[PDB]
Structure 1
Amino acid sequence: GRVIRNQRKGRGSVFTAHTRLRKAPAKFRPLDYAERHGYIRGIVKEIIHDPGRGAPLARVVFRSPYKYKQITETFIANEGMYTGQFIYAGKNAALTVGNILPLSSVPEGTVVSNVEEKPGDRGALGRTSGNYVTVVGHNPDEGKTRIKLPSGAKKVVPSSSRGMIGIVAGGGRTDKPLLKASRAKHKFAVKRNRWPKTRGVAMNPVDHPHGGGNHQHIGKASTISRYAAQGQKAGLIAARRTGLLRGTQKTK
């Protein structure tokens, strides 16, 4: 048989993400002395649209504590942020929307965005439009913080991890139907070469495990073991259950 499309995707080549129109990655400031001990003030210059990203980004200018230059950063814009707004990043920053604070100096029950998995990593969690991370609780003796992720998972991160107060802008982007093949094409044409998608059962046996046959049918259980070989993992990988979800799920 052939190498299947899912296997080919990992080679790169035509499946590499598009990057020309992306200006800079969305990252916090590097964790420095000012952010560790007090706060630093930055000015929002513009709210820009980043192709391939649903959420808008905010360009924020800060002063260098050690040089005469000025530094422009690219944050994920939280909804409610505006051009000409002062934002504050640090331990002693006020608890207002757009401020970047360590989770230790944040009370329980507030939502943040671009939460660092570890301090200094400049943001990893809850960075997509309409998404946020909730600060469930604190453990000061352990120096840790329990948070709730957009997926519903519970995580524990060091209290020094930073986050931006508020909710990622971009609202309910997925609330309107795409309604058109062209609109799906435009959505993915700035992300990746993954659209359109041909069904495996419409292929031939040389091309996919779902293969051919005189009727379009999978012919064997579509749930595939977690430890199946590469080239076998087509369908529902390591599926605990299948079928329509007809009630609440114990797992979360």
Structure 2
Amino acid sequence: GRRTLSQRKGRGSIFKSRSHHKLGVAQHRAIDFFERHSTVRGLVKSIEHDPGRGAPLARVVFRNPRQYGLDKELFICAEGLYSGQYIYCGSKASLHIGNVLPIGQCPEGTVVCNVESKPGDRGIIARASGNYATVISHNADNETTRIRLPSGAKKTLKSNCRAMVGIIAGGGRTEKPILKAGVAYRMYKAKRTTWPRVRGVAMNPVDHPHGGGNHQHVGHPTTLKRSSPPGQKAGKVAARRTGLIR
């Protein structure tokens, strides 16, 4: 047989990211002394639209802690941020929307975003539109805190992991019904090559494991093991349940 489209996607030739007009990498500033033991102030100069992502990006300008000059940053904008606003990053930062604090300084029940998974790694979790994580509980015995990920899973992180207080702006993006195939075509302008998806049943046996015969049907169960080799792992993998749940 041939190689399925899922296999051809891993070589990354026409499936590379269309990341030419992107603003840059959106993350916190590199952790230094002035943010471990003090606070720095950053000015929100502008709010921009990063191609390929649904949330706006903020161009924050911190002055400098040690040398003369500027430190131009690029944050993921929290909902409620405005141009000309002063935001603060540091351990002693106040509990306001848009500030970046260590996760241990946030009281239980605080709503944060752009949380770090590992301290000093400049943000991992809760970065898509309208997404956030909630602080569940703290643990000073081992300097760890528990947060609730946007998928509902609970994660235990170091208490000095950093996060920004508030909601990621742009919520409700997916609640608007795409109506035209053209609109879906433009949605992937600054994304990968994935959109027009040919069903496996509509292919031939060489192209896909679903490539059927005289009637368009799969023919074998669509739930497969995780240990299935690439090229046969088509359908639902390690499906605990299946069907319209009740």
> TM-score, length-normalised on structure 1?
0.97
Match of 2:132 in 1: 132
Contact 2:200 2:211 in 1 (8 A): yes
SS of alignment partner, residue 201 of structure 1: helix
For 1:23-49, what per-residue CA distance to the aligned partner results, in whole angstroms no more than 9, with x for missing partners? 211110001111100110000000000
Question: Which AA in structure 2 matches 1:134?
Answer: T
Contact 2:144 2:156 in 1 (8 A): yes
What is the distance in 1 between the residues matched to 2:19 and 2:180?
25
Match of 2:216 in 1: 216
Which of structure 1's runs of 4+ aligned residues deviate more than 6 A? none
- Is 1:54 equivalent to 2:54 in the alignment? yes
SS of alignment partner, residue 104 of structure 1: helix
Match of 1:230 in 2: 230
- Is 1:101 equivalent to 2:97 in the alignment? no
Shift of 1:189: 2.1
Gaps of 5+ in 1: 247-252
Counterparts of 1:74-153 in structure 2 under 5 Å? 74-153=74-153
Counterparts of 1:57-72 in structure 2 under 5 Å? 57-72=57-72
Shift of 1:182: 0.6
Counterparts of 1:171-210 in structure 2 under 5 Å? 171-210=171-210
Shift of 1:245: 1.3
Gaps of 5+ in 2: none
- Number of residue-to-residue matches in the alignment: 246
Question: Which AA in structure 1 matches 2:181?
Answer: A
What is the distance in 1 between the residues matched to 2:225 and 2:75?
40
Shift of 1:63: 1.4
Question: Which AA in structure 2 matches 1:104?
Answer: G
Shift of 1:140: 0.7
Match of 1:161 in 2: 161
Match of 1:242 in 2: 242
Matched-pair identity in %? 59
For 1:118-148, what per-residue CA distance to the aligned partner results, in whole angstroms no more than 9, with x for missing partners? 1100000000111001000100111000000
